[PDB]
Design a protein around this ligand. Structure first.
Ligand SMILES: Nc1ncnc2c1ncn2[C@@H]1O[C@H](COP(=O)(O)OP(=O)(O)OP(=O)(O)O)[C@@H](O)[C@H]1O
Ligand SMILES: Nc1ncnc2c1ncn2[C@@H]1O[C@H](COP(=O)(O)OP(=O)(O)O)[C@@H](O)[C@H]1O
Ligand SMILES: [Cl-]
Ligand SMILES: [Cl-]
Ligand SMILES: [Cl-]
Ligand SMILES: [Mg+2]
Ligand SMILES: [Mg+2]
Length: 550
């Protein structure tokens, strides 16, 4: 594997939730250890499981992994770091300012942005400690910082300017005032990230058009920033020696082969390695090492049942939520189609390009975001100096900015949810709704269980379910309780003779049980489609069927 050759002292793995960042991190950690190298694996996931895979406990202290000499680990819990980070800002003014005030500021430090900034504070610590390279040859991170976070800390304005405490725009700039290291260390860290002699960035992806799109995006952003030592690792690829008998496995192998060959242009000139889809979720040194080789039904109702229940009231705001790529848009489309075929007036709204009983409102997120950014600039940038304006423009470059702008656009038609059905394929986070509420926002409507039905879409996989769970908890803090969960891309409810797909379908079981037993009131299982759910044809196939009853 090219990504394994000549790794510099700092190695970072980046990619969407569930692509396999941690697995590959551990497997690489082992490979290096067995070569006689001293390796430090840095676990950075919210609910770390690296200790589990290695059959021991790890913590905020560097401890050796007894089950593999040469390797040690360290956990950097991001939720805890965020907590301490927020508390380090608020505790000082606690008792000096009103409670509602300290309460509002605390909320401003409870979003994904504060977490990335606090996580960057930790990365900076490790990256600027030369002594570490005195003890190890390699330091491996199972997540990487975003281009957004790096930009923010490299902006001069972030150091010489300050932005008022308004309701819009700079909403997420609050964390900056929390940095306690000197400006020079953060710049040094970024310097270390941009040095190919010190840091190698590995983009983890899967052979899917949608995912490669995102990865290609990340690559460009991190490169313009200065990280040009990038490697592409395509994980979980299906071996042709499985497309043999079964028809689904053959359709999949085909879908991957097209993409694999039609890789986005930007990723083409990138050194690339592919890993194979393993039978069982790696859990030991043996299983993990096997990953780096060069050679190879649940009792849950169909989407149809969920929709029949959504259909009872005969109207309502239906919002699909979840992480990027889980299938929000497809479920939104599938739901809107079935509801319409049941004879109801349905208004589907989307933020992506794709009978008369159904109307579709397409919104371009790019222009909504710009209308928004433009608005926040006439409002706040008014008295900012140029450096500060750039800081404000980078803050309005946050994920949540688009999220907010698109919701505001949708809100234009939310008033129709009273007479009929309005289905949305994306929504802001709990944190963001709470923020907007303090500012416009139909908060009460979203919180009403009879008017709004929020659905959480996820995958029958560990990380996705975890991230889904956390989204839900955040929404609940905003008084919104998801009405049901949709587990998309399931091999369990799929027709396959392929021995490997069956072994994979069996891996989902504990994840699916998790959702039913601990995360959701209602659940729907959608199959991994043998085709691209692009036509209303295959879109109707996703739903399955629901037997009428009284
Ligand atoms: N059940 C399924 N079977 C096969 N493919 C699916 C399924 N659900 C989604 N996909 C495919 O996966 C891709 C991602 O899904 P989709 O665009 O609906 O996700 P999303 O969460 O709306 O994405 P984003 O977060 O990018 O807006 C699509 O190209 C789509 O056709
Ligand atoms: N190529 C692969 N084949 C089969 N399973 C894999 C592969 N890569 C990862 N997994 C399994 O998939 C999940 C994806 O998780 P993981 O490494 O934790 O990553 P991330 O950090 O990308 O969320 C785990 O259940 C894991 O053991
Ligand atoms: Cl945020
Ligand atoms: Cl935040
Ligand atoms: Cl019925
Ligand atoms: Mg992980
Ligand atoms: Mg979408």
């Amino acid at each position: 594997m090219q990504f394994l050759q000549n790794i510099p002292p700092y190695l970072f793995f980046t990619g969407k939730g569930g692509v396999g960042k941690t697995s590959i991190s551990c497997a690489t950690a082992i490979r290096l250890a067995e070569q006689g190298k001293r390796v430090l694996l840095v676990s950075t996931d919210p609910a770390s499981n690296v200790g589990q895979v290695f059959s021991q406990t790890i913590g905020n202290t560097i401890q050796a992994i007894a089950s593999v000499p040469g390797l040690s680990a360290l956990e950097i819990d991001p939720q805890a770091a965020a907590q301490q980070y927020r508390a380090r800002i608020v505790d000082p003014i606690k008792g000096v300012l009103p409670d509602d005030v300290v309460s509002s500021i605390n909320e401003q430090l409870s979003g994904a942005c504060t977490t990335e900034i606090a996580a960057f504070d930790e990365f900076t610590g490790l990256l600027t400690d030369a002594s570490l390279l005195t003890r190890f040859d390699h330091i491996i991170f199972d997540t990487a910082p975003t281009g957004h976070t790096i930009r923010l800390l490299q902006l001069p304005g972030a150091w010489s300017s300050f932005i008022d405490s308004n309701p819009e725009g700079a909403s997420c700039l609050g964390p900056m005032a929390g940095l306690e290291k000197q400006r020079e260390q953060y710049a040094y860290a970024v310097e270390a990230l941009s040095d190919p002699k010190r840091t190698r960035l590995v983009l983890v992806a899967r052979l899917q058009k949608s995912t490669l799109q995102e990865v290609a995006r990340t690559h460009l952003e991190l490169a313009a920033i200065g990280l040009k030592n990038q490697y592409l690792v395509i994980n979980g690829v299906l071996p042709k020696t499985e497309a043999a008998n079964d028809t689904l496995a053959a359709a999949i192998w085909e879908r991957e082969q097209e993409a694999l060959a039609n890789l986005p242009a930007d990723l083409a000139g990138l050194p690339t390695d592919t890993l194979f889809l393993q039978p069982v979720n790696m859990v030991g040194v043996s299983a993990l090492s096997r990953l780096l080789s060069t050679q190879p039904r649940p009792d849950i109702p169909s989407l149809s049942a969920l929709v029949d229940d959504i259909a009872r009231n005969e109207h309502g705001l239906i919002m699909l939520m979840g992480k990027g790529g889980v299938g929000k848009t497809t479920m939104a489309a599938a739901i809107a189609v079935r509801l319409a075929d049941m004879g109801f007036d349905v208004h589907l709204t989307t933020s992506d390009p794709a009978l008369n009983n159904l109307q579709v409102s397409r919104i371009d997120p790019h222009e909504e975001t710009e209308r928004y950014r433009q608005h926040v600039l006439e409002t706040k940038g008014k008295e900012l100096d140029e450096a500060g304006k750039r800081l404000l423009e980078e803050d309005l470059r946050s994920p949540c900015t688009e999220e907010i702008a698109v919701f505001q656009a949708f809100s234009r038609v939310i008033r129709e949810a009273g007479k009929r059905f309005v289905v949305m394929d994306t929504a802001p986070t709990g944190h963001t709704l709470l923020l907007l509420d303090a500012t416009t926002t139909p908060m009460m409507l979203l919180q009403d269980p009879e008017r709004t039905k929020v659905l959480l879409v996820t995958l029958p996989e560990t990380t996705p379910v975890l991230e889904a769970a956390n989204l839900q908890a955040d929404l609940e803090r905003a008084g919104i309780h998801p009405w049901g969960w949709i587990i998309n891309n399931s091999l369990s409810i799929a027709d396959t003779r392929s021995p490997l797909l069956r072994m994979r379908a069996q891996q989902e079981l504990p994840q699916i049980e998790s959702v039913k037993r601990q995360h959701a009131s209602r659940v729907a299982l959608v199959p991994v489609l043998a085709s691209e759910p692009t036509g209303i044809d295959k879109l109707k196939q996703l739903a399955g069927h629901h037997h009428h009853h009284h």
